[PDB]
Structure 1
């Protein structure tokens, strides 16, 4: 009877040691994870799609402007020609 109890205590102590090692590993893993407070949220961050769309609108206007300037320069050259 006593021997059987001793063997159960042995198994329990082994299980506990294993659990302690699991916990030690878990703590290390947690320390590698990012905190919610330190990570910029989707709400806060600009997406490539959004930026691309607004950049495209600007680019089209710049292209329009460049064409207008070229046309104007040609008109002026025509006006000033002898």
Structure 2
């Protein structure tokens, strides 16, 4: 059954051929992936949404300050009879 062995070998060669192709693809895919060492994880970062919320709170405080200052400027104008 030498011909039978020859058939099993060709089957094996085709399996290997497709595996080698899949490995070539995999290696390329892996090179497009980010390393753990080069990135930060979610626990280490604020999102845009979170930063926006923090910034909006600062804006609010600044606007309250601007209103206070404007009131003071008019209080001064009143004191100066001006």
RMSD between aligned alpha carbons? 1.6
2:66 paired with 1:66: yes
Moved over 3 A (4+): none
| Counterpart-to-counterpart distance in 2, 1:24 and 1:41 | 29
TM-score, length-scaled by structure 1? 0.83
Q: Kindly state the Cα deviation for residue 49 of structure 1 after the two structures are TM-superposed.
A: 3.1
Structure-2-length-normalised TM-score: 0.83
1:31 — aligned with what? Answer: 31
Query: Which deviates further from its counterpart, 23-32 or 41-50?
Result: 41-50
- Tell me, what secondary structure is at the counterpart of 1:46? coil
Query: Post-superposition shift, 1:66?
Result: 1.0
1:34-80 deviation per Cα after TM superposition (whole angstroms, max 9, x unaligned): 11121211111122233223222221211111111111111111111
For structure 2, list consecutive stretches of 5 or more residues without a partner in the other structure. Answer: none
Secondary structure of 1:7's aligned partner: helix
- Structure 1, unmatched stretches of 5+, are none
